[PDB]
Design a protein around this ligand. Sequence first.
Ligand SMILES: COc1ccc2c(c1)c(CC(=O)O)c(C)n2C(=O)c1ccc(Cl)cc1
Ligand SMILES: [Zn+2]
Ligand SMILES: [Zn+2]
Lengths: 179, 177
Amino acid sequence: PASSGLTDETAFSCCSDPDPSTKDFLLQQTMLRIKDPKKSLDFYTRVLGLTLLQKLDFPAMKFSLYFLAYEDKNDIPKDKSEKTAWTFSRKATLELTHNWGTEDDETQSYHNGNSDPRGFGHIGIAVPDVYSACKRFEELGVKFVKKPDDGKMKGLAFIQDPDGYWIEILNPNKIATII
Amino acid sequence: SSGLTDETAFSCCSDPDPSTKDFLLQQTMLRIKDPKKSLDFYTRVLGLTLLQKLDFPAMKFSLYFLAYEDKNDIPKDKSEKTAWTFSRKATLELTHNWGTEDDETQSYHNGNSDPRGFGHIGIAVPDVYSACKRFEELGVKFVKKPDDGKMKGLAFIQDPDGYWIEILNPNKIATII
Ligand SMILES: COc1ccc2c(c1)c(CC(=O)O)c(C)n2C(=O)c1ccc(Cl)cc1
Ligand SMILES: [Zn+2]
Ligand SMILES: [Zn+2]
Protein backbone atom coordinates (compact mmCIF):
# COMPACT_ATOMS: atom_id res chain seq x y z
CA PRO A 1 0.00 0.00 0.00
CA ALA A 2 1.52 3.29 -1.22
CA SER A 3 1.57 5.89 1.58
CA SER A 4 -1.46 8.18 1.62
CA GLY A 5 -0.29 9.65 4.90
CA LEU A 6 -2.19 9.20 8.13
CA THR A 7 -5.92 9.49 8.53
CA ASP A 8 -6.90 12.04 11.16
CA GLU A 9 -7.74 8.90 13.18
CA THR A 10 -4.28 7.33 13.19
CA ALA A 11 -2.66 10.75 13.70
CA PHE A 12 -4.69 11.56 16.80
CA SER A 13 -4.37 7.97 18.02
CA CYS A 14 -0.62 8.67 18.20
CA CYS A 15 -1.24 11.67 20.45
CA SER A 16 -0.96 11.46 24.26
CA ASP A 17 -2.23 14.00 26.80
CA PRO A 18 0.76 15.75 28.38
CA ASP A 19 2.30 14.09 31.40
CA PRO A 20 1.97 16.33 34.45
CA SER A 21 5.78 16.64 34.54
CA THR A 22 5.62 18.52 31.23
CA LYS A 23 2.94 20.98 32.36
CA ASP A 24 5.19 24.07 32.54
CA PHE A 25 7.35 23.33 29.49
CA LEU A 26 7.40 26.07 26.85
CA LEU A 27 8.67 26.23 23.29
CA GLN A 28 11.25 28.89 23.95
CA GLN A 29 13.48 29.24 20.91
CA THR A 30 14.40 28.35 17.34
CA MET A 31 18.12 28.64 16.63
CA LEU A 32 19.51 29.63 13.24
CA ARG A 33 23.13 30.26 12.45
CA ILE A 34 23.81 33.69 10.89
CA LYS A 35 26.77 34.89 8.80
CA ASP A 36 26.53 38.58 9.65
CA PRO A 37 24.52 40.04 12.56
CA LYS A 38 24.80 43.55 11.09
CA LYS A 39 22.50 42.41 8.29
CA SER A 40 20.40 40.00 10.33
CA LEU A 41 19.74 42.45 13.16
CA ASP A 42 18.67 45.13 10.65
CA PHE A 43 16.34 42.76 8.79
CA TYR A 44 14.67 41.26 11.81
CA THR A 45 14.15 44.52 13.76
CA ARG A 46 13.60 47.04 10.89
CA VAL A 47 11.83 44.82 8.37
CA LEU A 48 9.95 42.38 10.62
CA GLY A 49 9.60 44.44 13.79
CA LEU A 50 11.17 42.08 16.31
CA THR A 51 13.10 43.37 19.27
CA LEU A 52 16.62 42.32 20.24
CA LEU A 53 16.12 41.02 23.74
CA GLN A 54 19.73 40.22 24.54
CA LYS A 55 23.23 39.83 23.09
CA LEU A 56 25.36 37.19 24.81
CA ASP A 57 29.05 36.85 24.03
CA PHE A 58 31.06 33.68 24.58
CA PRO A 59 34.78 34.54 24.12
CA ALA A 60 35.98 31.05 25.07
CA MET A 61 34.10 29.56 22.12
CA LYS A 62 34.19 32.62 19.78
CA PHE A 63 30.48 33.00 19.19
CA SER A 64 27.62 35.33 20.10
CA LEU A 65 23.91 34.64 20.65
CA TYR A 66 21.33 37.21 19.60
CA PHE A 67 17.82 36.68 20.94
CA LEU A 68 15.02 38.38 19.09
CA ALA A 69 11.30 38.22 19.75
CA TYR A 70 8.12 40.25 19.52
CA GLU A 71 8.36 41.92 22.92
CA ASP A 72 8.23 45.50 24.15
CA LYS A 73 11.80 46.72 24.79
CA ASN A 74 10.51 48.50 27.91
CA ASP A 75 9.78 45.09 29.42
CA ILE A 76 13.40 43.93 29.21
CA PRO A 77 15.22 44.03 32.56
CA LYS A 78 18.36 46.18 32.25
CA ASP A 79 20.27 44.10 34.77
CA LYS A 80 22.38 41.44 33.04
CA SER A 81 21.37 38.58 35.37
CA GLU A 82 17.69 39.56 35.31
CA LYS A 83 17.80 40.18 31.56
CA THR A 84 19.04 36.62 31.13
CA ALA A 85 16.30 34.92 33.16
CA TRP A 86 13.67 37.03 31.40
CA THR A 87 14.96 36.44 27.82
CA PHE A 88 15.22 32.65 28.29
CA SER A 89 11.69 32.50 29.64
CA ARG A 90 9.99 34.27 26.74
CA LYS A 91 7.87 32.21 24.35
CA ALA A 92 8.68 32.14 20.63
CA THR A 93 12.15 33.65 20.42
CA LEU A 94 14.74 33.47 17.67
CA GLU A 95 18.23 32.61 18.74
CA LEU A 96 20.60 33.80 16.08
CA THR A 97 24.05 32.27 16.50
CA HIS A 98 27.04 34.18 15.20
CA ASN A 99 30.35 32.31 14.96
CA TRP A 100 32.88 35.14 14.94
CA GLY A 101 34.57 35.93 11.66
CA THR A 102 32.03 34.45 9.24
CA GLU A 103 31.00 37.91 7.96
CA ASP A 104 34.51 38.49 6.58
CA ASP A 105 34.94 35.02 5.04
CA GLU A 106 33.91 35.23 1.38
CA THR A 107 33.86 31.43 1.13
CA GLN A 108 31.28 30.92 3.86
CA SER A 109 27.50 30.67 3.82
CA TYR A 110 24.84 28.77 5.76
CA HIS A 111 22.37 26.34 4.19
CA ASN A 112 18.68 27.08 4.42
CA GLY A 113 17.36 23.50 4.49
CA ASN A 114 15.24 23.77 1.34
CA SER A 115 17.52 22.14 -1.20
CA ASP A 116 19.65 18.96 -0.98
CA PRO A 117 20.18 18.07 1.83
CA ARG A 118 16.71 19.09 3.06
CA GLY A 119 15.44 19.25 6.63
CA PHE A 120 14.46 22.50 8.34
CA GLY A 121 12.04 24.41 6.10
CA HIS A 122 11.34 27.86 7.57
CA ILE A 123 10.05 29.94 10.45
CA GLY A 124 6.71 31.72 9.98
CA ILE A 125 5.08 35.00 10.99
CA ALA A 126 1.34 35.77 11.36
CA VAL A 127 0.37 39.19 10.06
CA PRO A 128 -2.98 40.98 9.93
CA ASP A 129 -2.60 41.57 6.21
CA VAL A 130 -0.26 39.69 3.86
CA TYR A 131 -0.73 41.95 0.81
CA SER A 132 0.13 45.17 2.66
CA ALA A 133 2.98 43.55 4.59
CA CYS A 134 4.48 42.31 1.28
CA LYS A 135 4.03 45.62 -0.51
CA ARG A 136 5.99 47.11 2.38
CA PHE A 137 8.59 44.33 2.14
CA GLU A 138 8.88 45.13 -1.61
CA GLU A 139 9.47 48.82 -0.95
CA LEU A 140 12.18 47.77 1.49
CA GLY A 141 14.00 45.53 -1.02
CA VAL A 142 13.18 42.20 0.65
CA LYS A 143 13.96 39.10 -1.44
CA PHE A 144 10.93 37.01 -2.21
CA VAL A 145 10.69 33.26 -2.53
CA LYS A 146 6.96 33.47 -3.27
CA LYS A 147 4.96 36.68 -3.77
CA PRO A 148 1.46 36.59 -2.21
CA ASP A 149 -0.41 36.00 -5.47
CA ASP A 150 2.14 33.88 -7.33
CA GLY A 151 1.57 30.10 -7.35
CA LYS A 152 -1.78 28.52 -6.45
CA MET A 153 -1.76 29.36 -2.73
CA LYS A 154 -2.97 32.94 -3.11
CA GLY A 155 -2.63 35.18 -0.08
CA LEU A 156 0.44 33.39 1.23
CA ALA A 157 4.09 34.47 0.87
CA PHE A 158 7.62 33.37 1.62
CA ILE A 159 10.42 35.86 2.01
CA GLN A 160 14.13 35.32 2.79
CA ASP A 161 16.34 36.75 5.51
CA PRO A 162 19.93 37.83 4.80
CA ASP A 163 21.18 34.22 5.15
CA GLY A 164 18.47 32.99 2.80
CA TYR A 165 16.37 31.33 5.52
CA TRP A 166 12.76 31.15 4.40
CA ILE A 167 10.07 32.98 6.34
CA GLU A 168 6.39 32.26 5.69
CA ILE A 169 4.11 35.31 5.76
CA LEU A 170 0.51 34.38 6.55
CA ASN A 171 -2.87 35.71 7.68
CA PRO A 172 -4.22 33.16 10.17
CA ASN A 173 -7.80 34.30 9.55
CA LYS A 174 -7.57 33.53 5.80
CA ILE A 175 -5.66 30.21 5.68
CA ALA A 176 -8.78 27.98 5.79
CA THR A 177 -9.99 29.61 2.57
CA ILE A 178 -6.94 28.29 0.71
CA ILE A 179 -6.86 24.99 2.64
CA SER B 1 37.84 36.96 15.04
CA SER B 2 36.38 39.24 17.72
CA GLY B 3 32.65 39.62 16.99
CA LEU B 4 30.44 42.68 17.41
CA THR B 5 30.72 45.21 20.19
CA ASP B 6 27.48 46.14 21.87
CA GLU B 7 27.65 49.53 20.08
CA THR B 8 27.79 47.99 16.62
CA ALA B 9 25.10 45.40 17.33
CA PHE B 10 22.74 47.86 19.01
CA SER B 11 23.18 50.45 16.24
CA CYS B 12 21.88 47.92 13.71
CA CYS B 13 18.56 47.54 15.50
CA SER B 14 15.58 49.75 14.53
CA ASP B 15 12.47 50.26 16.64
CA PRO B 16 9.48 48.33 15.24
CA ASP B 17 7.59 50.09 12.49
CA PRO B 18 3.97 50.55 13.61
CA SER B 19 2.81 48.51 10.60
CA THR B 20 4.41 45.38 12.14
CA LYS B 21 2.19 45.94 15.18
CA ASP B 22 0.59 42.59 15.87
CA PHE B 23 3.05 40.49 13.87
CA LEU B 24 3.81 37.29 15.78
CA LEU B 25 6.40 34.51 15.47
CA GLN B 26 3.97 31.74 14.71
CA GLN B 27 5.75 28.54 13.57
CA THR B 28 9.01 26.73 12.94
CA MET B 29 8.67 24.08 10.20
CA LEU B 30 10.60 20.78 10.13
CA ARG B 31 10.31 17.97 7.59
CA ILE B 32 9.73 14.60 9.25
CA LYS B 33 10.30 11.10 7.90
CA ASP B 34 7.65 9.38 10.07
CA PRO B 35 4.64 11.15 11.61
CA LYS B 36 3.69 8.24 13.88
CA LYS B 37 7.07 8.48 15.61
CA SER B 38 7.16 12.28 15.56
CA LEU B 39 3.65 12.76 17.04
CA ASP B 40 4.34 10.21 19.77
CA PHE B 41 7.58 12.04 20.58
CA TYR B 42 6.26 15.59 20.67
CA THR B 43 3.08 14.71 22.59
CA ARG B 44 3.95 11.83 24.93
CA VAL B 45 7.61 12.68 25.44
CA LEU B 46 7.58 16.46 25.18
CA GLY B 47 4.02 17.28 26.19
CA LEU B 48 2.91 19.33 23.20
CA THR B 49 -0.63 19.02 21.83
CA LEU B 50 -1.51 18.33 18.20
CA LEU B 51 -3.66 21.33 17.26
CA GLN B 52 -4.52 20.43 13.69
CA LYS B 53 -3.57 18.21 10.79
CA LEU B 54 -3.77 19.31 7.12
CA ASP B 55 -3.54 17.03 4.10
CA PHE B 56 -2.77 18.03 0.52
CA PRO B 57 -3.23 14.87 -1.57
CA ALA B 58 -2.60 16.84 -4.77
CA MET B 59 0.99 17.31 -3.64
CA LYS B 60 1.29 14.24 -1.41
CA PHE B 61 2.00 15.69 2.03
CA SER B 62 0.51 16.43 5.43
CA LEU B 63 1.19 19.33 7.81
CA TYR B 64 0.93 18.75 11.57
CA PHE B 65 0.67 21.67 14.00
CA LEU B 66 1.70 21.22 17.61
CA ALA B 67 1.97 23.64 20.49
CA TYR B 68 1.95 23.88 24.26
CA GLU B 69 -1.80 24.49 24.34
CA ASP B 70 -4.79 22.99 26.21
CA LYS B 71 -6.70 20.81 23.75
CA ASN B 72 -9.98 21.94 25.34
CA ASP B 73 -9.20 25.36 23.86
CA ILE B 74 -9.19 23.98 20.31
CA PRO B 75 -12.26 24.99 18.29
CA LYS B 76 -14.37 22.13 16.92
CA ASP B 77 -15.49 23.53 13.55
CA LYS B 78 -12.80 23.54 10.88
CA SER B 79 -12.74 27.23 9.93
CA GLU B 80 -12.57 28.43 13.51
CA LYS B 81 -9.96 25.80 14.39
CA THR B 82 -7.77 26.83 11.49
CA ALA B 83 -7.88 30.52 12.39
CA TRP B 84 -6.97 29.73 16.03
CA THR B 85 -4.12 27.29 15.25
CA PHE B 86 -2.45 29.77 12.91
CA SER B 87 -2.72 32.50 15.53
CA ARG B 88 -1.04 30.61 18.39
CA LYS B 89 2.53 31.75 19.23
CA ALA B 90 5.36 29.20 19.19
CA THR B 91 3.96 26.31 17.15
CA LEU B 92 5.75 23.48 15.35
CA GLU B 93 4.80 22.56 11.82
CA LEU B 94 5.98 19.07 10.93
CA THR B 95 5.93 18.31 7.22
CA HIS B 96 5.50 14.71 6.15
CA ASN B 97 6.09 13.96 2.48
CA TRP B 98 4.10 10.76 1.84
CA GLY B 99 6.37 7.79 1.19
CA THR B 100 9.51 8.66 3.19
CA GLU B 101 8.53 6.48 6.18
CA ASP B 102 8.82 3.39 3.92
CA ASP B 103 12.12 4.45 2.26
CA GLU B 104 15.17 2.96 3.95
CA THR B 105 17.61 5.18 2.08
CA GLN B 106 15.88 8.40 3.15
CA SER B 107 16.76 10.75 5.99
CA TYR B 108 16.54 14.48 6.62
CA HIS B 109 19.45 16.69 7.56
CA ASN B 110 19.39 18.29 10.98
CA GLY B 111 21.56 21.32 10.11
CA ASN B 112 24.25 20.44 12.66
CA SER B 113 26.75 19.01 10.20
CA ASP B 114 28.02 20.31 6.85
CA PRO B 115 26.24 22.08 5.38
CA ARG B 116 25.17 23.83 8.64
CA GLY B 117 22.24 26.24 9.15
CA PHE B 118 19.26 25.56 11.40
CA GLY B 119 20.49 24.35 14.77
CA HIS B 120 17.63 23.44 17.10
CA ILE B 121 14.42 24.27 18.86
CA GLY B 122 14.65 24.76 22.61
CA ILE B 123 12.35 23.87 25.50
CA ALA B 124 12.28 25.88 28.72
CA VAL B 125 11.62 23.54 31.65
CA PRO B 126 11.44 23.81 35.45
CA ASP B 127 14.11 21.19 36.14
CA VAL B 128 16.54 20.06 33.50
CA TYR B 129 17.75 17.05 35.49
CA SER B 130 14.32 15.64 36.31
CA ALA B 131 13.26 16.34 32.73
CA CYS B 132 16.25 14.47 31.29
CA LYS B 133 15.96 11.63 33.79
CA ARG B 134 12.49 11.00 32.46
CA PHE B 135 13.64 11.35 28.83
CA GLU B 136 16.36 8.73 29.56
CA GLU B 137 13.81 6.40 31.09
CA LEU B 138 11.61 6.84 28.00
CA GLY B 139 14.30 5.88 25.49
CA VAL B 140 15.00 9.40 24.21
CA LYS B 141 18.41 9.79 22.49
CA PHE B 142 20.84 12.44 23.77
CA VAL B 143 23.41 14.70 22.14
CA LYS B 144 24.57 16.35 25.35
CA LYS B 145 23.58 14.94 28.72
CA PRO B 146 22.70 17.71 31.24
CA ASP B 147 25.82 17.03 33.32
CA ASP B 148 28.41 16.63 30.55
CA GLY B 149 30.85 19.40 29.76
CA LYS B 150 31.48 22.93 30.97
CA MET B 151 27.84 23.98 30.76
CA LYS B 152 26.19 21.62 33.20
CA GLY B 153 22.46 21.96 33.72
CA LEU B 154 21.74 22.30 30.02
CA ALA B 155 21.03 19.44 27.61
CA PHE B 156 20.36 18.56 23.98
CA ILE B 157 18.23 15.60 22.94
CA GLN B 158 17.18 14.39 19.47
CA ASP B 159 13.67 13.94 18.04
CA PRO B 160 12.93 10.87 15.86
CA ASP B 161 14.51 12.59 12.83
CA GLY B 162 17.71 13.62 14.60
CA TYR B 163 16.80 17.31 14.97
CA TRP B 164 18.37 18.76 18.12
CA ILE B 165 16.19 19.98 20.95
CA GLU B 166 17.73 22.12 23.69
CA ILE B 167 16.53 21.60 27.24
CA LEU B 168 17.11 24.60 29.46
CA ASN B 169 16.13 26.13 32.77
CA PRO B 170 15.76 29.92 32.43
CA ASN B 171 16.53 30.49 36.14
CA LYS B 172 19.82 28.65 35.94
CA ILE B 173 21.18 29.96 32.63
CA ALA B 174 22.94 33.11 33.89
CA THR B 175 24.59 30.93 36.52
CA ILE B 176 25.68 28.40 33.90
CA ILE B 177 27.58 30.99 31.83
C1 LIG C 1 31.92 28.91 26.42
O1 LIG C 1 31.82 27.49 26.36
C2 LIG C 1 30.63 26.96 25.94
C3 LIG C 1 29.58 27.79 25.59
C4 LIG C 1 28.38 27.24 25.17
C5 LIG C 1 28.24 25.86 25.12
C6 LIG C 1 29.31 25.01 25.47
C7 LIG C 1 30.51 25.58 25.88
C8 LIG C 1 28.85 23.66 25.31
C9 LIG C 1 29.69 22.43 25.52
C10 LIG C 1 30.12 22.32 26.96
O2 LIG C 1 29.16 22.52 27.79
O3 LIG C 1 31.25 22.07 27.30
C11 LIG C 1 27.56 23.70 24.90
C12 LIG C 1 26.64 22.55 24.65
N1 LIG C 1 27.15 25.03 24.76
C13 LIG C 1 25.87 25.49 24.29
O4 LIG C 1 25.36 24.96 23.32
C14 LIG C 1 25.19 26.62 24.98
C15 LIG C 1 24.32 27.42 24.25
C16 LIG C 1 23.67 28.48 24.84
C17 LIG C 1 23.90 28.77 26.17
CL1 LIG C 1 23.17 30.18 26.88
C18 LIG C 1 24.75 27.99 26.92
C19 LIG C 1 25.39 26.92 26.33
ZN1 LIG D 1 19.86 27.53 21.83
ZN1 LIG E 1 4.82 26.94 7.13
